[PDB]
Amino acid sequence: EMQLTPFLILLRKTLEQLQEKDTGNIFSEPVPLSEVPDYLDHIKKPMDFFTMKQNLEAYRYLNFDDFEEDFNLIVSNCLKYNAKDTIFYRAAVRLREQGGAVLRQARRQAEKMG
């Protein structure tokens, strides 16, 4: 029923909006494992906005929940790995806060499609 192209257009816009909230671009690329050698010790599934864009374009997000789940991993991995008193941890809290409103608006648009 629901068409694929307008859904992917929405996800592209939503991803851009989420990225815009990450003003430091600290989530724009994968955590460099060369520089954080213990990262995979703690984090089961790394995620970042570039990997999300690739997934998007590989038609790997066919419902809103799967897209939102990867965004949430960006946040949750960061909260997990970094101490509370760091800029990184607080950036993840802020992203959670500001990304929430973005996601809620985008999900309503997706619901209007079905």
- In the chain, the largest separation of any two C-alpha atoms, in whole Å, equals 48
Instruction: Give me 57's structure tokens.
Output: 């374009």
| CB-based contact 95:77 (threshold 8 Å) | no
State the Cα–Cα distance between residues 60 and 42, nearest whole angstrom.
Answer: 25
State the Cα–Cα distance between residues 109 and 99, nearest whole angstrom.
Answer: 15
Experimental method: X-ray
CA 3 to chain CA centroid, Å, is 23
The neighbour count for residue 41, using CB atoms within 10 Å, is 8
CA 24 to chain CA centroid, Å, is 15
Domains of the chain: 1-114 (1.20.920.10)
Which residues, 6+ apart, have CB-to-CB distance to 103 below 8 Å? 14, 18, 68, 71
Resolution (A): 1.6
CA 36 to chain CA centroid, Å, is 20
Query: What is the full DSSP assignment across 27-78?
Result: TSS---TTT-TTHHHH-SS---HHHHHHHHHTT---SHHHHHHHHHHHHHHH
